[PDB]
């Protein structure tokens, strides 16, 4: 029941969340995405085990609005920021692109949170999956 950050983790496979909902995705491979994302919402993935330092994250995203950003934190939604990712308008809620951002994560096992940030006035993005790189 550990999660491997160096292979895709599906965003709907969260252990806790605040503010979001899931739906079926039109992205290739099918499956699901999280959506209805607003400024301050988050998702938690428990027991994510890094055997080696991570230096970036890659996230599969879509947005019909101006987008926003994803903060990577551990331990709690307020835990130290380890990196972030900018998410642009992609031309629609099921128009998918992969974005990346730097992180610094040392080996260990963590509760990983993706915390969504942007304007409070519109929903920000959809997320299919994410994966870290060393
Ligand atoms: Na929301
Ligand atoms: Na960044
Ligand atoms: Na997914």
Swiss-Prot record:
> Cellular location of this protein?
Secreted
* Disulphide bridges, residue numbers: none
**Domain (CBM6) ranges:** 7-133
Binding, (1,3-beta-D-glucosyl)n: 23, 36, 64, 89, 123, 126
Family as reported in the entry's similarity comment: Belongs to the glycosyl hydrolase 81 family.
What this chain does, per the record? Cleaves internal linkages in 1,3-beta-glucan. May contribute to plant biomass degradation.
Domain comment in the entry: The CBM6 domain binds the non-reducing ends of beta-glucan; this domain may therefore target the enzyme to polysaccharide termini in damaged regions of the plant cell wall susceptible to catalytic attack. The CBM56 domain modulates binding affinity for beta-glucan and aids binding to insoluble beta-glucan.
Q: What name does this protein carry?
A: Glucan endo-1,3-beta-D-glucosidase
From which source organism is this entry? Halalkalibacterium halodurans (strain ATCC BAA-125 / DSM 18197 / FERM 7344 / JCM 9153 / C-125) (Bacillus halodurans)
């Amino acid at each position: 029941d550990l999660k491997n950050p160096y292979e895709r983790i599906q965003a709907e496979a969260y252990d806790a969340m605040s503010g979001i909902q899931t739906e079926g995705t039109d992205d290739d491979g099918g499956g699901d995405n999280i959506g209805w994302i607003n400024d301050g919402d988050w998702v938690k993935y428990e027991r994510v085990h890094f055997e080696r330092d991570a230096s970036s994250i890659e996230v599969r995203v879509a947005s019909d609005t101006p987008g926003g950003r994803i903060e990577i934190r551990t331990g709690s939604p307020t835990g130290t920021l380890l990196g972030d990712v900018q998410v642009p308008n992609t031309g629609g809620w099921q128009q998918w692109q992969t974005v990346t951002g730097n992180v610094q994560i040392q080996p260990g096992t963590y509760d990983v949170y993706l915390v969504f940030k942007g304007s409070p006035e519109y929903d920000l993005m959809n997320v299919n999956w994410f994966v870290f790189r060393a």
